[PDB]
Write a protein that binds this ligand. Structure first.
Ligand SMILES: O=C(NCc1c(C(=O)O)[nH]c2ccccc12)c1ccc2[nH]c(O)nc2c1
Length: 167
């Protein structure tokens, strides 16, 4: 038993809700919140900009030190950093950005990072300003992640479409 509430169950291990991931994280304080990161951990917009803003820019400060030490992530890769006031940990995961021409097949590799964590609160990778089809992202999620994932979908219209079209 965990503290996630109001989720619709899609499969044995995948759950979904129309919610702002920032507010969901603030209330649940999950062990892991996933950020929709880029390889530079520059948290300007989308989910990343919103999560970072909620940490009063502490996420960005920590991220800049990480990059200065380690260099950029790989597309499809991840790193574990602090969750600040939102979670114990933040798993920064880089899905391919279609608006940069990155290979969509890397979306499966991105979701594989979730399997290193028993339970996660996460957005749909490569959705929103990353330009991929969210219906496809949900399918890859369900077919790749084996650990327990609670997906927060900000837009109510998209949430309804994702549920109604789910196979
Ligand atoms: O951009 C937001 N969601 C779109 C999105 C999702 C998703 O929703 O599944 N996944 C992504 C991955 C990369 C880029 C964008 C997205 C968002 C989230 C919380 C907010 N809170 C607030 O005040 N504004 C917000 C905007």
């Amino acid at each position: 038993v965990n503290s996630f509430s109001g989720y619709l169950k899609l499969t044995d291990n995948v759950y979904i809700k129309n919610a702002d991931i920032v507010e969901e994280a603030k209330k649940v304080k999950p062990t892991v919140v996933v950020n929709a990161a880029n390889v530079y951990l520059k948290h300007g917009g989308g989910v990343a900009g919103a999560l970072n803003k909620a940490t009063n820019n502490a996420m960005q400060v920590e991220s800049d030190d990480y990059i200065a030490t380690n260099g950029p992530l790989k597309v499809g890769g991840s790193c574990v950093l602090s969750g600040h006031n939102l979670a114990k940990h933040c798993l920064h995961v880089v899905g391919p950005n279609v608006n940069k021409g990155e290979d969509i097949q890397l979306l499966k590799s991105a979701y594989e990072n979730f399997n290193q964590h028993e339970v996660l609160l996460a957005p749909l990778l490569s959705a929103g300003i990353f330009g991929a089809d969210p219906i496809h992202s949900l399918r890859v999620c369900v077919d790749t992640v084996r650990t327990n994932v609670y997906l927060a979908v900000f837009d109510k219209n998209l949430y309804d479409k994702l549920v109604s079209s789910f196979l």
